[PDB]
Amino acid sequence: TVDLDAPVQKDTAMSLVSSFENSSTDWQAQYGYLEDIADGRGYTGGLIGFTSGTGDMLELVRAYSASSPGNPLEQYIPALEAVNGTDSHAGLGQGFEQAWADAAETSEFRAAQDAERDRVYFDPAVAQGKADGLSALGQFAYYDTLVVHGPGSQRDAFGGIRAEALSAALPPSQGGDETEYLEAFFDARNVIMREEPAHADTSRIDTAQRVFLQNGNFDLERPLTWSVYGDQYSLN
Numbered sequence: 001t002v003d004l005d006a007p008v009q010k011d012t013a014m015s016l017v018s019s020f021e022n023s024s025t026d027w028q029a030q031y032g033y034l035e036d037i038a039d040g041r042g043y044t045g046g047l048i049g050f051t052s053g054t055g056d057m058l059e060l061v062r063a064y065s066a067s068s069p070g071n072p073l074e075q076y077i078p079a080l081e082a083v084n085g086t087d088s089h090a091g092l093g094q095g096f097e098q099a100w101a102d103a104a105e106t107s108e109f110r111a112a113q114d115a116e117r118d119r120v121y122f123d124p125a126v127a128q129g130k131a132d133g134l135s136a137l138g139q140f141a142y143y144d145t146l147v148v149h150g151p152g153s154q155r156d157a158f159g160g161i162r163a164e165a166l167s168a169a170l171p172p173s174q175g176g177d178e179t180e181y182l183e184a185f186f187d188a189r190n191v192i193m194r195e196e197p198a199h200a201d202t203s204r205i206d207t208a209q210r211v212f213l214q215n216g217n218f219d220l221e222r223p224l225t226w227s228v229y230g231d232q233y234s235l236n
């Protein structure tokens, strides 16, 4: 079976998401990413945009300090605990930004980021996609939704988005046509993307994922070409 967790499909998924987050297919270059993009989530960092506002950057740092005691970020745990649930930089700032840059040089921090990615975002996407009888492209649709909207049963989280899809169209696991199901899933997601100004550009769906679907590239196979934000990417 061709799934998004095969080595090449996973590598493709990482480049897709890095194009959407960082306008680069060079996903391995993004572990050191750190920016407050003025969305109200505070610091956004690393491969998949962990945030200081939403809990996951804190969870990542705590896991990193478990596996690598005394790393440069560990001293910023109390400040990450204090700012969680807000976009405050209080207690972080230049020393924290330099500590992120230092940690991103280490295989240990990259491994922590990979682990958090896989536990919270990638493995749930793939497992749920397979349960729904989706192809690699469908699993990808799930993974990008979890990256942007996060896990959860709320209407604006992955679980709610998937629920809304299922209300509109049967998944392939129940005999539904995959194209119709993914159209309904993209259209459920579109609604949610548009409710937030930082998310209102939907090009990561419209000029990339919908294009793969139109092309019938269900295995998300290379060569692949797409656009996001008006810029073209390709993978071979």
Ligand SMILES: N[C@@H]1[C@@H](O)[C@H](O[C@@H]2O[C@H](CO)[C@@H](O[C@@H]3O[C@H](CO)[C@@H](O[C@@H]4O[C@H](CO)[C@@H](O[C@@H]5O[C@H](CO)[C@@H](O[C@@H]6O[C@H](CO)[C@@H](O)[C@H](O)[C@H]6N)[C@H](O)[C@H]5N)[C@H](O)[C@H]4N)[C@H](O)[C@H]3N)[C@H](O)[C@H]2N)[C@@H](CO)O[C@H]1O
Pocket: 019, 020, 021, 022, 023, 024, 037, 039, 041, 044, 048, 049, 050, 051, 054, 055, 056, 147, 148, 149, 150, 151, 152, 156, 157, 198, 199, 201, 229, 230, 231
């Ligand atoms: N060549 C130029 C172009 O570059 C230029 O275009 C710009 O290009 C920028 C660079 O690529 C681009 O910036 C990126 O924009 C995106 C979209 O805003 C940013 O993406 C962010 O992705 C984060 C991913 O992690 C999101 O974070 C997640 O948020 C969710 C929802 O809050 C959370 O979920 C909760 O999690 C908890 C568990 O912790 C759970 O309890 C809850 O239930 C969950 N719901 C996650 O925790 C969190 N990780 C974030 O939402 C999202 N905004 C990215 O960072 C930017 N770098 C620009 O957008 C783009 N315009 C163009 C412009 O014209 O010009 C060309 O010439």
